[PDB]
Design a protein around this nucleic acid. Structure first.
Lengths: 156, 97, 56
RNA sequence: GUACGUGAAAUUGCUGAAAGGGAAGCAUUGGAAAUCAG
RNA sequence: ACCAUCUAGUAGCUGGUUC
RNA sequence: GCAGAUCUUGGUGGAAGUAGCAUUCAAAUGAGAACUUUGAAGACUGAAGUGGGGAAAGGUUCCAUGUGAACAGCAGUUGGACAUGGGUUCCAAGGUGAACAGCCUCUAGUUGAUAGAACAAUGUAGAUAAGGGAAGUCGGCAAAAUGCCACUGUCCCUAUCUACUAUCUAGCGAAACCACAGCCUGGGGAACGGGCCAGGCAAAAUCAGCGGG
RNA sequence: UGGACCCACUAAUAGGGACUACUGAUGAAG
RNA sequence: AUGUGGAACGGGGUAUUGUAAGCAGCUGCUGAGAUUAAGCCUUUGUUCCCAAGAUUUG
RNA sequence: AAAACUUUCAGCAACGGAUCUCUUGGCUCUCGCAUCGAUGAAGAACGCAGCGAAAUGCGAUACGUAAUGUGAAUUG
């Protein structure tokens, strides 16, 4: 994968390729849900699916409508792409299952790494998606040294 | 929890200025929305006969006030919504035994 | 889906698709029958009801 | 790993670092941080 | 009207022409 | 031996997530239902039909079963799509009425066109307007008055009301164009400019209008 | 200034030049 | 986040319209009846709801 | 005077298919030979395999039969 983590010590992995979702919306959802606790991310995705929270649009923010639900992230522009969230929800189900398989502690899991890459254009622009969940945790010169020696004797 | 309360609705204030072609749909929308705000539940179930008296007078003509009965029946907790007919629809909310 | 069953029932009863009515609690029984004789047997048993002509 | 030898650039994403008050890029001189070399 | 050959045409010019 | 030829072929960008694209309830199926199906209502087409058939043309699209895609510019469990087998111009109800007119129906058929939320600036379409009745405009342009006189929001002077676009949301999603960029004043022989000079100055990210440049 | 050089009103109806900005709306931050 | 709390109805007031069916002999019950907040006022009326969840905060 | 945003740098992953290596191919040159058809040519169509859709092979004897040679396969 992309990052030096995914060591089997305290990690679990999941990925998706050629997922039929827009690249830019998937990127914005990935950026937002990065670093959150795993169970915390789930309800947040449930909130976005049910319009009780919105994912900020930061890089691909062209023409987004301003909403009051983008206030928690400090931005003025927010949107609720539900297709990409459903793709992310399924991916997190699989990553959660892989965590079960390896045998971690699921209560303290965090989204350590998530990255969306462009896929062979087929037109739509598919997106490769990958998720990592894991756990948290001179010298002394002759004159300088001689002065150090004299001051050492001075204190005593 | 399981309770049956007979309610009455003032649709005319709720349908004031609503587009004629959308008078009937928004009505049904409002009843279910009303149901949540009084039953504290999110999902409901509407008697198909109830919709019959909703559409008796067409799509744009809905009676100003209607009498309804809400029952918090246990799910398979849903709210079955039934039409209640009285000579005059102007009485206070009652708790049907 | 009971489009095939509805078409067979309409042909058997010689009535239009509007005149054909089915019991809401007999979907499995109606879908199981696929033969004309089975449709006639279901009609005789009362599974399918032909709606009479209304008004003029 | 059949989207299969090698896998470049344009181009995109993530991490790390740094800079930014109506541009930037470049050159000379040094400072700072990193990193070498005798 | 189109097609293929003659054709790599008439070029007195336009543009480009590599450490 | 390449930086150029509005070079050739292939690949990739910004523009840009931008421009843009009459049903309701309940039940069943199904991972998944606003689009599948069933029951009910709303309706719509309406015997010169969105009915029942044929000719020309098509060729298996017919039928049942099955469904990861692809296709049905949303969706899809459904499909003239995919797979597997199987299979050989004619007719013209009732009422109104002169009428095969229009309108409502009768028998039959459709609920399909991305959808949701609101209603603000603009625009399109449509109405009413006190008092004056061509003063607007080169002008009876367009409506109004019927199917010199008279009428009229053309105007004085606009106001209000309705639908749609419009905006926002879920989905789908371009292209032109592109050396690099984008505050202003004066000066730079010219052409004075967006870069130079001298100043004024200068604090992220954006949303909607006006298009001045 | 209002009407076809005119004919009135009027205090008077003088003579001339010519992506960014603009208008509103949010907004992170010492 | 439990109170002259909030909501849903209902009553009263104010309004718009112009006297509802039926009965009795055009008349009387009938300034009736209907609508009344959707950008009207008020409520000892009846009922319910709330003594929450998530996030960001030196 | 943070974060986001933009830009630059490096690591990693995408995207793309350059580079390198190869090769039952092409191109060029030389040499040799003379052989279509009414006894139905060249070409076309339809068929023929156990399962082939592909290319060749073949003609109802149909991816061939007879004869000779080799000697023990065919192949997903």
């Amino acid at each position: 994968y992309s990052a030096s983590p995914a060591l089997e010590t305290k990690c679990a992995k999941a990925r998706g390729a050629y997922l039929r979702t827009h690249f830019k919306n998937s990127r914005e959802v990935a950026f937002t849900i990065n670093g959150m606790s795993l169970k915390k991310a789930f309800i947040f995705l449930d909130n976005v699916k049910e319009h009780k929270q919105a994912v900020p649009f930061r890089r691909f923010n062209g023409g987004v409508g301003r909403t009051a639900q983008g206030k928690e992230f400090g931005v003025t522009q927010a949107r609720w792409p539900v297709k990409s969230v459903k793709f992310f929800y399924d991916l997190l189900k699989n990553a959660e299952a892989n965590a079960e398989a390896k045998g971690l502690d699921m209560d303290k899991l965090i989204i350590k790494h998530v990255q969306v890459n462009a896929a062979p254009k087929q037109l739509s622009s598919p997106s490769h998606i990958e998720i990592i969940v894991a756990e948290e945790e001179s010298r002394v010169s002759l004159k300088q040294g001689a002065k150090a020696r004299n001051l050492a004797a001075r204190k005593a | 929890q399981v309770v049956t309360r007979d309610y009455t609705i003032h649709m005319h204030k709720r349908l004031y200025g609503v587009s004629f072609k959308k008078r009937a749909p928004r009505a049904i929308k409002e009843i279910v929305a009303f149901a949540q705000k009084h039953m504290q539940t999110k999902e409901v179930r509407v008697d198909p006969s109830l919709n019959k008296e909703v559409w008796k007078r067409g799509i744009r003509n809905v009676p100003h006030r209607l009498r309804l009965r809400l029952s918090r029946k246990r799910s398979d907790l849903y709210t079955y919504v039934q039409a209640v007919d009285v000579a005059n629809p102007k009485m206070e909310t009652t708790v049907v035994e | 889906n009971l489009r095939t069953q509805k078409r067979l029932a309409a042909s058997v009863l010689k009535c239009g698709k509007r005149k054909v009515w089915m019991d809401p609690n007999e979907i499995s029984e109606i879908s199981n029958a696929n033969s004309r004789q089975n449709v006639r047997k279901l009609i005789k048993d009362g599974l399918v009801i032909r709606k009479p002509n209304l008004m003029h």
